[PDB]
């Protein structure tokens with residue numbers, strides 16, 4: 001699809017078997033959600049946001065389905081006001097910003 | 100133009116007689132810039148992100164030029180570590196996401 005930006009660009013994806021509404025965020029290097037149930041171990045990651053740097057959990061090789069594509073990707077879990085999918089995943093689905 | 104997202108989409112904008120490099124950010128509701136002195140009255144606003152709330156000044160009808168288009172736009176000014184243009188300005192220049 002070609003999405004205009006008058007509204008927030010929210011899509012529904014599947015992650016670790018659960019449907020989650022996520023904001024498509026070109027200004028985010030990474031994909032981060034608050035308090036989703038993902039199995040297995042993780043490693044600490046420090047990410048920078050507008051308010052400073054925040055520690056999150058990093059989960060690798062997570063199966064996700066986005067706009068019809070089934071991929072595995074890195075997913076961060078931590079105290080974000082918005083669940084976002086960032087360029088790491090947007091690149092996996094071939095997304096572009098056009099103007 | 101069509102921009103893939105493997106790189107951060109950084110464009111220059113002219114504003115307040117200066118040239119600034121800004122991230123084209125579909126995740127930001129509104130443009131926010133750190134180091135800039137804009138003239139006239141403004142209203143205080145809080146914006147929410149990773150790392151909590153950030154206090155900004157909202158300036159309205161600011162002349163800017165971006166991607167070759169001159170418009171007036173809302174600009175938030177406050178201590179972001181990364182300057183971004185948000186959906187308010189991306190819509191003024193007809194930017195879309197495509198996947």
Ligand SMILES: CC(C)CN(C[C@@H](O)[C@H](Cc1ccccc1)NC(=O)O[C@H]1CCOC1)S(=O)(=O)c1ccc(N)cc1
Nearest residue numbers: 027028029030049050082126127128129146147148181
């Ligand atoms: C939905 C969110 C997170 C909104 N922000 C936009 C995001 O694009 C934000 C842009 C940014 C990049 C680098 C450092 C600082 C900020 N990236 C971000 O946090 O990336 C993290 C999360 C995962 O990857 C890394 S915002 O900056 O809080 C914001 C909020 C309101 C306005 N009007 C403008 C900006």
